[PDB]
């Protein structure tokens, strides 16, 4: 059970940007406001997932060309092990 505004915070500059065609970057990319906002602990990092998926809520199906390349240039820096199926965001 923990969140973060950081996802949407990182993207925020970039919102009308990211959600265009082509590649943005070059102008600005959540990562670079993410080079400023690093994690504190190893269990901390599962923010990060937790995170990249409350800004699908800003890019639904309308958009699936940018949402497929979205973390192809701008994602969160999560760390976890790689497993067939992971369950993230899910609540009892």
């Known amino acids: 059970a923990i969140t973060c505004g950081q996802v949407d ?3 925020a500059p970039c919102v009308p940007f990211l959600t265009q065609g082509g590649e943005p970057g ?3 990319c959540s990562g670079v406001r993410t080079l400023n ?4 602990s190893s269990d901390d990092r599962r923010t990060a997932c937790n995170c990249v998926k409350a800004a699908a809520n800003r890019y639904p199906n309308l958009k699936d060309d940018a949402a497929q390349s979205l973390p192809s240039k701008c994602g969160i820096s999560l ?9 993230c965001d899910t609540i009892s």
């Not at 760390?79 to 369950?87: A, K, L, Q």
């Open 79 to 87: 760390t976890v092990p790689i497993s067939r199926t992971v369950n």
């Open 26 to 28: 070059a102008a600005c």
């Open 9 to 11: 915070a990182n993207l």
């Open 37 to 40: 906002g690093n994690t504190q």
